[PDB]
Amino acid sequence: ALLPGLYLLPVPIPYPLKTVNLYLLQGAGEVALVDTALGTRAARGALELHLAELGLCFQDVKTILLTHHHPDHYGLSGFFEGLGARVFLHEEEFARGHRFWREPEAFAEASWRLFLDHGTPEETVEKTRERVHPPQNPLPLRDGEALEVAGKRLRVLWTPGHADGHAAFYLEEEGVLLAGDALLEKVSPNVGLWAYTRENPLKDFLRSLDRLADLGARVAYAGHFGPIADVRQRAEELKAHHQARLEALLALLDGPKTAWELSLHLFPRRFAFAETLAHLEYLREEGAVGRGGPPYRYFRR
Ligand SMILES: [Zn+2]
Ligand SMILES: [Zn+2]
C-alpha cells in the first residue's frame, strides 16, 4: 500500500523492460486500475493473483485509466471493457496510437516505409497485436481535467513525447504522481518517432519533463522500475541525458549516415531506431543536421 487504497501491481511483460507497474485504487465503493498490462498467460495470471490478494476479481474493476497506448499499459483495456469497465484514454491517442491498434491497416504501409527509407534492411508487431485487446468505446481525457476515482482526486497531466496522448495522473493533495512512462528512475523512457507520431516528439518530451520538474510532486510512481523520490531531480537528469544523446548523435555524423546504422551506435532494435529517428528530426528542425534522399542519409552541417 503506497497510500491507503493505492497499491503497486508489478506485472511481467515479454519486452526488454520485463515488468510493468500497474496501480490499483480502491475506496468509496469503487475499484480502478491505472494501466492494464497485456494478454499473455503470465501477465493475466499475475494480475489475477494481485487482485485475488486484495479480495477482487477482474469483474470488480469498473474504471480503467490509461497513461498511454503502448501494449504493456493498454493491452488488457478491451478485456476489462468487455466485462463492463469504463476505459479512459487521453484525446491525443485517439487518432494516433489508439487508431494504430483499432485499424491495423491505417498506418501499416507508412510504418514499413519509414523503416525502409531510413536504411532498415529486410513480425514481432503481429505477435504484439495478438496480445492487445483494444477498447471499443474509450472516453477521451483532457489536460487539466479532474477525476474523482475511488475516493481520490486525480489531475490529468498531458505529457506528450513518450507517446502522443501520454497522460500522467496527479494526486494533488498527497503530492503523489502516477507518472506512467513520462518519467523513469533508471533509464530514459523511449522517445520514438513512428508513422502516427506528432511532428517533433523529442521537443514534446523535453517540454513534458519541464512541466513535471516544476510540478512540486513529492514522489512519483512510474510505469517501470522503482519509485522516484525527487521528481524535479530525475526530470532534470533526463533533460541532461537527452542533451548528451544529441551531442553523441552529432559526433556520430562524421559522414552521411542512415537512421538505422546510427541507431546501432547511439544504442550500443525497433525502439532504438525510432528513438534515433526522433533525435535526428529534432536536430534537423533546429537546422543542425540536414538530409539527402530518400533513401534518407543525415549529415552534420
Ligand atoms: Zn510506454
Ligand atoms: Zn511502459
Residue that terminates a domain, selected from 214, 233, 252: 252
The ligand that comes nearest to the alpha carbon of residue 191 is 1
37's grid cell: 498490462
Secondary structure of residue 148 in the 3-state scheme: strand
Buried/exposed 205-232: b ≥16 CB within 10 Å, e otherwise:
bbebbebbbebebebbbbbbeeebeebe
End-to-end CA distance of the chain: 53
Q: Is 265 annotated as a binding residue?
A: no
Same domain, 248 and 282: no
CA–CA distance, 289 with 299 (Å, rounded to integer):
6
CA–CA distance, 114 with 212 (Å, rounded to integer):
31
Secondary structure of residue 99 in the 3-state scheme: helix
Same domain, 85 and 115: yes
The ligand that comes nearest to the alpha carbon of residue 222 is 2
Contacts for 187 with CB less than 8 Å, ≥ 6 apart: 225
CA–CA distance, 259 with 120 (Å, rounded to integer):
8
- Look up residue 188 and give its amino acid: S
Do 192 and 70 touch, CB atoms closer than 8 A? Answer: no
Cα-to-centroid distance, 288 and ligand 2 (Å): 31
- Look up residue 216 and give its amino acid: G
Q: Is 72 annotated as a binding residue?
A: yes
Same domain, 257 and 246: no
- Look up residue 274 and give its amino acid: A
Which helix (H) or strand (E) segment holds residue 137: the answer is: none
Sort strands 139-141 and 146-149 into parallel, antiparallel or unpaired.
Answer: unpaired
CA–CA distance, 71 with 93 (Å, rounded to integer):
13
Same domain, 89 and 25: yes
Q: Is 98 annotated as a binding residue?
A: no
The resolution, in Å, is 2.1
Sort strands 63-66 and 19-27 into parallel, antiparallel or unpaired.
Answer: unpaired
CA–CA distance, 267 with 245 (Å, rounded to integer):
10
- Enumerate residues preceding breaks in the chain (C to N > 2.5 Å): 122, 268
Same domain, 164 and 279: no
- Total domains in the fold of the chain: 2
Instruction: Using alpha carbons, select from 106, 89, 103, 224 the residue that is nearest to residue 163.
Output: 89
Secondary structure of residue 127 in the 3-state scheme: helix
Instruction: Using alpha carbons, select from 91, 64, 94, 96 the residue that is nearest to residue 78.
Output: 64
Sort strands 19-27 and 86-90 into parallel, antiparallel or unpaired.
Answer: unpaired
3-class SS shares of the chain: helix, strand, coil, % to 5: 35, 25, 40
Query: Radius of gyration of the chain from Cα atoms?
Result: 19
Cα-to-centroid distance, 157 and ligand 2 (Å): 17
Q: Which domain holds residue 200?
A: 1-252
The ligand that comes nearest to the alpha carbon of residue 271 is 1
Structural method: X-ray
Same domain, 212 and 274: no
Q: Domain of 290: which CATH number?
A: 1.10.10.10
Q: Is 181 annotated as a binding residue?
A: yes
Q: Domain of 92: which CATH number?
A: 3.60.15.10
